[PDB]
Design a protein around this ligand. Sequence first.
Ligand code: ATP
Ligand code: ATP
Ligand code: NA
Ligand code: NA
Lengths: 232, 230
Amino acid sequence: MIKLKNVTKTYKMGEEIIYALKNVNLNIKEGEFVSIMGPSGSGKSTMLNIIGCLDKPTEGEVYIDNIKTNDLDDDELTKIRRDKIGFVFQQFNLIPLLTALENVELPLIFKYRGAMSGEERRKRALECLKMAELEERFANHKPNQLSGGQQQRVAIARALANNPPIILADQPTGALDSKTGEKIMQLLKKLNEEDGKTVVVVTHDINVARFGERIIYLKDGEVEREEKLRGF
Amino acid sequence: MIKLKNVTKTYKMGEEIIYALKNVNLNIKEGEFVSIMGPSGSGKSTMLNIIGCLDKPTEGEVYIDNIKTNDLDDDELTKIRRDKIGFVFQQFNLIPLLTALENVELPLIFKYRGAMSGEERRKRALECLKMAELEERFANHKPNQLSGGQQQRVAIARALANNPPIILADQPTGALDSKTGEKIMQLLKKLNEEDGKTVVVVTHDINVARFGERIIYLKDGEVEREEKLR
Ligand SMILES: Nc1ncnc2c1ncn2[C@@H]1O[C@H](COP(=O)(O)OP(=O)(O)OP(=O)(O)O)[C@@H](O)[C@H]1O
Ligand SMILES: Nc1ncnc2c1ncn2[C@@H]1O[C@H](COP(=O)(O)OP(=O)(O)OP(=O)(O)O)[C@@H](O)[C@H]1O
Ligand code: NA
Ligand code: NA
């Protein structure tokens, strides 16, 4: 479902060439729940961004659902992202002037081909907010009228909106108390197991990582090692 | 050192009233290390913002270093924040066009004690980035050229810059791996014990909270309970 083939991501800082990722190889099967851990700065978000078609590798190849994405243009990558990917940003990236509900309705409307009635919109968006454990009374608040954890739940609800087959979550529980985070992880488990969604979670929380069937550890831009939490 | 007296913070949403904090009472002594925990939305940041003079209570009173902040004008409040408090934001709030180093230096330029030379300012700023465990090689990166955890460390270094007596950290380890977070907590322990700094940390991580002398738990805008540790 997701394949990174000899992926390198570099940045040129002055006269020095920096490696965010260096020759990484990764294959994630359809319906797999994979966790990604590693030191601050090890390359986790760069990896998730590349998998999410939000960034292109400097070298190497990327395949999402068998399609080589690394040579597609801006327009084309957008269609793939919208159809196949639900992305939970670490920084949330909510639109300031839209309410929590409107923020969730965005990717629903961008993906959906026809004309969706306001009633199906509100309804579906609400389902997403409920799955993301955010109380209905907060649906009307703008991002700046919400707490960090409430904002994180809006970010999670938005990733679910387009019912994408792939869910990429960058530290989805970072701003949540352990009880709320646990419900979020149970949601991801349910979508993965019952719905066959491919789930990839970047996290600094071992308890969160343990919901995966594999934990990939990065170190200095490279896959240092892997952990199989299931037999093979 | 910090006192919240019957503090309420309300928001008017339409015709509805929302109590971010409702009649909270809090007394933090000088040199105390206190942790604040509670469910998402319980009122932790509102509390820290009020203590940090970044927001005013709707009702109740606030005292910092024995000074009542309630009716101080904006310049008086800016003055208190600058001398008394080092604030680590949850969202970081770094200036996009300034490098990591420049972001840390900014507070030094507007510290109304005396006047630091350009060399002294830079040197103090590097010391702060080092205490915050950020490698020297990242000092020239702008916020957008840094990872989430690297940005968090710049935010922490900036809070340390004016060597304030009070440090307010809003989930200071949220974007850090446990190893780096542990060093940050060891730094706060060091500044608290060796330097007598008053430290208040809001966190969702119990391991982080356990560095405090006590842990204050919020629930629905109210202090639910307190738990002494040592
Ligand atoms: N401008 C506002 N208008 C309305 N409600 C607000 C506003 N700012 C904050 N709130 C509300 O006050 C309470 C929240 O915030 P605080 O920001 O104090 O939460 P926290 O306790 O810090 O939680 P989190 O762990 O989710 O960051 C929330 O329930 C939130 O919805
Ligand atoms: N635009 C950029 N220019 C230069 N270096 C960059 C840029 N974006 C990211 N990096 C670097 O690539 C590596 C980082 O990021 P990533 O953002 O992939 O880290 P992470 O592994 O997700 O870490 P964190 O836990 O801190 O979030 C870091 O060392 C970082 O400084
Ligand atoms: Na990151
Ligand atoms: Na908060």
